[PDB]
């Protein structure tokens, strides 16, 4: 095979440094084509003799004099003549065939001139269009991750092939140019046309291609100079800056960077930090070294209209991206198969960095609902996959893209947190420092971190492990899934088995370990911490730590630091329940949530009866804290989805109304009649969920609150009296109770909304009407770009479908309008998969299955496109629902009847 037909680069040539000059043209040509021009020189060293240069190039046209490149020797080195240059599209290469061989130890410079489309494709060097008044603005920006640096200039575009970069931007003289590094000095006029300026940037450190960035825009900044001279700037649209929306990001950045410099035992490795808010950046955020990009909703914050969960999103997303400025950027994983270590690490430490900026919020707890239980839903499937993938199976750009999923990020985070916990943070930080210092400006595999952590373990006598760090972590990284740990408290016997939600599933992926793990197990007995225990790679063991007396109780996995779920014999469950009903504060709040999370999953897997899971919600009438209530609500939304059109619903409603009333009443006093929010984040979250649960289950005191506040708003439109935290519930319930006066008022507010997040809440609340006619009229609007944006059409139809009354209307509308498929699957995506999922989510009967089959019977032309598999998934999900309702209906009805009084 020829090397230019292989996806991995040769190792014969390694880059030293690059000069790259880019010039975006932000005015289109005659035909509406936007382009950029560039010029580059790469200096590389020959390691082994070769008569071919292979370098990456994607969607670039070459205008170099002669062949596509010019090739020179550095210093007094001679250079072979070029035979020919060709582009090989499949493997994204520019190939320079030479008439003789390059020589080991010699350096060469390769110069090229090129151009590409400055497309609106969020890839490489690209354009982004947005509105300022009647005016349409266009800026130029970059997204290299993973394999798109090559789409902006020819480069050895693999993460381990690091080099220094000298970037220059040629741009309109009234626009600002930003890159990884500071400008060298003031811009100078382009001599051939002084309407353009030339901005040169300081040389980057040795770094990876995927982390480069350069941006040309009208943006402005808010700034601060940290004590060590590091300049910090938040960049955004002029009007966003003037509004003060960059201030929260600016406030937290300084503390976050200080936290990480200390955590990592390493100085921030750059002279400045720019972070930029881009309108509609669909990738969310990108950790470009010294110039981190974000979508606006992720970086900007409007105190007057934004909720607290909004603030939580800003501080954690910043902490995540800043974490990479060391872990990922300074020390880079050598290949994409180890992506999980980079993203998993940042996904864990984002909570630590954010906790430093907001220390009263207990943010570290949020990893449990946010990543652990979230990823366990997909890792408890037969179709999961290990964190680890062999390097040689990850080759194409598409294979690289598949590394970026829930397992890599959320299981990565969970497993790393588990590791830090069983090591202790102090020891983990020691190894982490050692790793960063040894590999700074270089590349690694996950085995290198384990080695440095082992060095830390071996240098102390306190923490003793049952095996090497690598052998333990291999159990968590080389095989998919996680165990359920089951304890028999009468004997103290403990067992582990691979946990699958579907007790009838066939696992066909084989494990080198037979799905046995080495498991760290903390425990608490009658509210007192016990000695730590390790379950070895055995199915079964026994320890007196897990043996109780019938008045005692024991609980495993404190704070769910371990990546596993726990089951007990029935008597121990009842003892835990008794404790939660008589003095809950003895069980850590995270474990009060765990009991609910785990037991609903166990009931799904048929390991406990569903009534045991429901019994675990009974303590909630005395619960004031956020997480355990959130656990219940996440675990019951499926119950509500299946039963909200059945005789089960009244009793379920009555049951939830009874559980939530004391909490609603608690906050009524605490908030001084809803006039002031709880102080800390968790309590604000608890209040939000309490109002939401109250209103949606028909608590009269909540309905009355919603009506009063919305009435008050309608009588004084410019002064919204509803705190951002409570808007989504208050808006929804007031519209549900009301009619066309409320609906028309909210529609008018939607059409003048300036802020995306406010517009979203309104769009969602409008779907809460209980008038069939209003919902059909609304559906009719969803396909009009004048009234409802394209990108919002399917969300809106979905919100309507989630209304019990809107369910038939949306389903009818989708079936009947399906042929908006020969109109919306050609110019722009239009997520069809999410629409199918959304409107079919409820289906739980044979009759509904028939309709979905009957409907599918229209493959005869049309097809489905982006949602072809989504439809198949809807048929399989409906069958699973049919079977679940049949097994569960009778038992669940009687439980709710029995416990609603």
């Amino acid at each position: 095979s020829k090397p230019w037909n292989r996806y991995r680069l040769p190792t014969t040539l390694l880059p030293d440094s690059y000069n790259v000059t880019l010039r975006p043209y932000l005015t289109p040509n005659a035909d509406g084509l936007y382009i950029f021009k560039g010029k580059s020189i790469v200096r590389f060293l020959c390691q082994e003799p070769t008569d071919v240069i292979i370098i990456h190039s994607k969607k670039l046209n070459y205008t170099t004099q002669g062949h596509m490149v010019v090739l020179r020797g550095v210093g007094d080195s001679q250079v072979p003549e070029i035979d020919r240059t060709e582009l090989v599209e499949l493997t994204e290469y520019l190939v320079v065939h030479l008439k003789g061989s390059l020589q080991p130890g010699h350096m060469y410079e390769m110069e090229s001139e090129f151009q590409g489309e400055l497309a609106d494709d969020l890839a490489g060097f690209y354009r982004s269009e947005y509105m300022e008044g009647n005016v349409k603005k266009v800026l130029a920006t970059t997204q290299m991750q993973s394999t798109d640096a090559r789409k902006s200039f020819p480069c050895f575009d693999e993460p381990a092939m690091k080099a220094t970069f000298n970037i220059t931007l040629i741009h309109p003289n009234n626009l600002t140019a930003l890159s990884n590094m500071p400008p060298k000095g003031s811009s100078t006029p382009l001599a051939e046309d002084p309407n353009w300026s030339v901005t040169e940037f300081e040389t980057t450190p040795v770094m990876s291609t995927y982390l480069l960035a350069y941006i040309v825009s009208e943006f402005q900044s808010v700034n601060e100079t940290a004590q060590n001279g590091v300049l910090i700037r938040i960049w955004a649209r002029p009007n966003a800056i003037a509004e003060g929306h960059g201030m929260y990001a600016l406030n937290v950045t300084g503390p976050i960077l200080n936290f990480f410099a200390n955590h990592y035992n390493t100085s921030y490795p750059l002279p400045k930090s720019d972070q930029i808010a881009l309108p509609d950046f669909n990738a969310g955020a990108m950790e470009n070294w010294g110039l981190v990009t974000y979508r606006e909703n992720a970086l900007l914050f409007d105190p007057q209209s934004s909720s607290i969960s909004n603030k939580e999103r800003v501080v954690t997303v910043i902490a995540h991206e800043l974490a990479h400025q060391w872990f990922g950027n300074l020390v880079t994983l050598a290949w994409w198969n180890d992506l999980w270590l980079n993203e998993g690490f940042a996904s864990y430490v984002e909570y630590l960095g954010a906790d430093h900026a907001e220390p009263t919020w207990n943010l570290k707890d949020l990893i449990v609902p946010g990543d652990v239980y979230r990823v366990m839903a997909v890792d408890a499937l037969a179709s999961s996959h290990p964190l680890t993938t062999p390097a040689e199976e990850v080759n194409t750009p598409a294979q690289i893209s598949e590394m970026f999923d829930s397992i890599s990020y959320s299981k990565g985070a969970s497993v790393i947190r588990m590791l830090s916990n069983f090591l202790t943070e102090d020891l983990f930080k020691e190894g982490l420092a050692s790793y960063l210092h040894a590999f700074a400006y270089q590349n690694t595999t996950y085995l290198d971190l384990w080695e440095h952590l082992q060095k830390a373990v071996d240098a102390q006598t306190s923490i003793r492990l049952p095996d090497t760090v690598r052998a333990i972590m291999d159990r968590w990284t080389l095989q998919m899934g996680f165990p359920v740990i089951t304890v028999d408290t009468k004997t103290g016997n403990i067992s582990q088995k691979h946990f699958l939600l579907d007790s009838e599933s066939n696992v066909t992926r084989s494990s080198a370990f037979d799905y046995l793990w080495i498991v760290p197990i903390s425990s608490i007995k009658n509210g007192v911490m016990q000695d730590h225990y390790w379950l070895r790679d055995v199915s079964q063991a026994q320890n007196d730590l897990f043996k109780t007396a019938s008045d005692d109780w024991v609980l495993l996995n404190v704070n769910v630091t371990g990546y596993f779920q726990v089951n007990y014999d029935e008597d121990n469950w009842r003892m835990i329940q008794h404790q939660l009903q008589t003095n809950l504060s003895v069980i850590p709040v995270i474990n009060r949530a765990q009991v609910i999370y785990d037991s609903f999953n166990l009931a799904t897997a048929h390991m406990v009866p569903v009534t045991l899971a429901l019994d675990n919600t009974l303590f909630l009438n005395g619960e004031k804290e956020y997480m355990p209530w959130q656990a219940a609500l996440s675990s019951l939304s499926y119950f509500s989805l299946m039963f909200d059109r059945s005789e089960v619903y009244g009793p379920m409603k009555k049951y939830l109304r009874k559980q939530v009333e004391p909490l609603f009443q608690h906050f009524e006093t605490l908030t001084k009649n809803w006039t002031e929010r709880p102080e800390n984040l968790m309590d604000q979250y608890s209040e939000i969920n309490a109002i939401s649960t109250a209103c949606s289950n028909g608590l009269p005191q909540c309905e009355n609150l919603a009506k009063t506040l919305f009435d008050q708003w309608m009588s004084d439109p410019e002064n919204n009296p509803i705190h951002p935290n409570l808007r989504s519930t208050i808006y929804c319930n007031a519209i549900a109770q009301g009619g066309q006066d409320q609906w028309d008022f909210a529609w008018g507010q939607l059409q003048q909304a300036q802020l995306v997040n406010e517009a979203d809440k309104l769009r969602s609340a409008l779907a809460c009407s209980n008038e069939v006619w209003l919902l059909n009229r609304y559906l009719g609007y969803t396909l009009n770009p004048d009234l409802i944006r394209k990108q919002d059409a399917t969300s809106t139809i979905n919100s309507i479908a989630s209304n019990v009354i809107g369910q038939p209307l949306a389903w009818d509308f989708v079936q009947s309008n399906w042929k908006k498929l020969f109109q919306d699957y050609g110019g722009g995506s239009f997520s069809f998969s999410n629409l199918i999922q959304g409107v079919t989510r409820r289906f739980s009967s044979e009759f509904e299955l028939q309709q979905l089959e009957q409907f599918k019977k229209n493959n005869m032309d049309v097809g489905f496109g982006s949602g072809t598999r989504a439809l198949e998934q809807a048929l399989e999900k409906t069958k699973a629902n049919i079977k679940w309702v049949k097994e569960n209906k009778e038992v669940v009805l009687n439980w709710f009847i029995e416990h609603s009084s």
């Binding site: 979508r295 999103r313 997303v317 995540h320 993203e343 996904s347 984002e350 949020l366 959130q630």
Partner: peptide, 6 residues
């Protein structure tokens, strides 16, 4: 954007 929602 990379954080991790609950």
């Amino acid at each position: 954007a990379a954080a991790a929602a609950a």
